[PDB]
From a paper:
Bacillus sp. AHU2216 α-glucosidase (BspAG13_31A), belonging to the glycoside hydrolase family 13 subfamily 31, specifically cleaves α-(1→4)-glucosidic linkages and shows high disaccharide specificity. BspAG13_31A has three domains common to GH13 enzymes: domain A, a catalytic domain that adopts a (β/α)8-barrel fold; domain B, a long loop connecting the third β-strand and third α-helix of domain A (β→α loop 3); domain C, a domain formed by two antiparallel β-sheets that follows domain A. The maltose moiety of G3 and maltotetraose (G4), covering subsites +1 and +2 of this enzyme, adopts a less stable conformation than the global minimum energy conformation, presumably because of steric hindrance by Asn258 at subsite +2.
Crystals of E256Q/N258G and E256Q/N258P were prepared by co-crystallization in the presence of 5 mM G3 and G4, respectively, and the structures of E256Q/N258G and E256Q/N258P were solved at 1.7 Å and 1.5 Å resolutions, respectively. Torsion angles of d-glucosyl residues in subsites +1 and +2 of E256Q/N258G and E256Q/N258P were close to the torsion angles of d-glucosyl residues in the stable α-glucan: Φ (5-O, 1-C, 4′-O, 4′C) = 102° and Ψ (1-C, 4′O, 4′-C, 5′-C) = –120°, which is considered the global minimum energy structure. A molecular mechanics study of maltose suggested that torsion angles of d-glucosyl residues at subsite +1 and +2 in the E256Q-G3 complex are less stable than the global minimum, and the conformation of G3 observed in E256Q/N258G and E256Q/N258P is predicted to be more thermodynamically stable than that in E256Q. This conformational difference of G3 presumably arises from the elimination of steric hindrance by Asn258. In the E256Q/N258G-G3 complex, an additional hydrogen bond between Met229 and 3-O of the d-glucose residue at subsite +2 is predicted.
Author numbering: 3 to 289, 294 to 517, 521 to 555
Amino acid sequence: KKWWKEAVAYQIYPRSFMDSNGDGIGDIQGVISKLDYLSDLGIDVIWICPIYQSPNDDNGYDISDYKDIMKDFGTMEDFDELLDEVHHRGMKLIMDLVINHTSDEHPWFLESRSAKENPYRDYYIWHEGKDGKEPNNWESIFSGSAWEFDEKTKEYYMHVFSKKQPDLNWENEKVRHELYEMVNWWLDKGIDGFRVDAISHIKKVAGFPDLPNPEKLDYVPSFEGHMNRPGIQEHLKELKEKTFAKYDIMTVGQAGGVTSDSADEWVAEDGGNFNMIFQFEHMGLWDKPLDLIELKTILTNWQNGLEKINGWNALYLENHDQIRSVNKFGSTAYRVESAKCLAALYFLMKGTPFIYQGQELGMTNVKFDSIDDYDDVGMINYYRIQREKGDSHDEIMKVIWETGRDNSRTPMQWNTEKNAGFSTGNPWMKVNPNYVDINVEEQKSDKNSVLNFYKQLIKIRKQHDVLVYGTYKLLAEEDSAIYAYTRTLEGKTAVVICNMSPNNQTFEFPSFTNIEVLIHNYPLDKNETLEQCTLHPYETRVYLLS
Ligand SMILES: OC[C@H]1O[C@H](O[C@H]2[C@H](O)[C@@H](O)[C@@H](O[C@H]3[C@H](O)[C@@H](O)[C@@H](O)O[C@@H]3CO)O[C@@H]2CO)[C@H](O)[C@@H](O)[C@@H]1O
Ligand SMILES: [Ca+2]
Ligand SMILES: [Ca+2]
């Protein structure tokens, strides 16, 4: 019923995808050079992370010119070539729309900060201090205060994210008008839509009241002051009417603070802000084995919850903000098996699946010895803030190694040449040493590779409508090792069975005129009875019943 429901999306982090000119930084001509790879994978939609002019304090999410390409990545002519090549391959491109905040080097902010009476002052969020300190006790998501003092005008500006990412004032009609014009300027070029960044953060609680601080911390996590706050829907409804609704595009909103039963306004077919949202509930399961049943509960709540409102799920396990999914949800002791198990698990639920670069190879976390090898502004600021407070170097590195999103930002691993073929120079972030084992070139020619498993997943989803539009139903809910579910559409039922445990397990097949195995990550045992499945660690199978 919709092209974006049937699509499989691939997410490119361009700084780490392909360097075409030896400076160690991925670029647009690098992306163009690998479009055959994404075509051959079977990708329908490419989401490219921000490629706009940026000082790169937050690697593109701090934008200083919305209408110019980041110099590191190329020019508008390179972008025009990329879009032309993508569209001639029958693929689509969505851009990363970043309008909660700008760079502090954006011309609007350079005007805004210059004087209280500057006409751009109210484009951002300014407030006098309180009792000689910040206007309130809110913490930035990147640690430290959510307020930065301006010596010249003697006021603080708010930044939910880095000090170089001042938040835009969405209560200002002039701001909204300029943002809508710029969105439509991009849409007029014929891009196919947007992933909408941090979009849950655009409504701040008026008066910015202090939050509880019983532990007398320096600052306190401030989501209750700015994540999905009452009043946000007025802005998002206007954004949709003034921009997205005028074009045949897809939108996926990155929307924290939305629950599976309160998602109508965000994604309902009748009146939702977006076609689909990224929600974070399944990415917050920290400890000793993974709580499989809590994962079932979360994902099933979203399957059932959006089915009731005619919404649509964005399916994912990886992106540029998370650690690698083999680490987070699988096992490094069963890297290939668990990568495939996880793939079948998340990809075949009802929704639009996203593949993050390297996920299709089973890429895993890195451990660099030195803080100087890392880049993430959030984790570097965390280091500095916590080191100042007396946290030891080793305690801080443990947090960065186990939770830091730099784990997903190491160069894409193309082959076993220098830098895994990502660059002829010195990569901006070092390649994971396991590229000698994990790389596209080796996986292409190995029928058993993670890459070719993803290829077959994409193919079976395209060829069987039940895997796109079939109703989801959780099976065997209480089983602490097996995640199993069905997809049903008329006379076809797909059964997805995943042994999400590092042990052998036995599972009773749910009890058709015909049965077919669509995909499997272990050799099939001829003597095995369908009724009593003897599953190996992280074994997955997908059956098709008529
Ligand atoms: O452009 C700044 C930043 O924005 C994007 O990521 C941010 C999310 O928008 C924001 O909601 C927050 O995510 C947190 C979730 O709300 C919370 O449920 C849980 O998942 O912890 C997260 C805290 O970090 O913060 C992220 C960034 O950390 C964008 O995708 C980022 O790349 C970008 O840096
Ligand atoms: Ca380059
Ligand atoms: Ca067996």
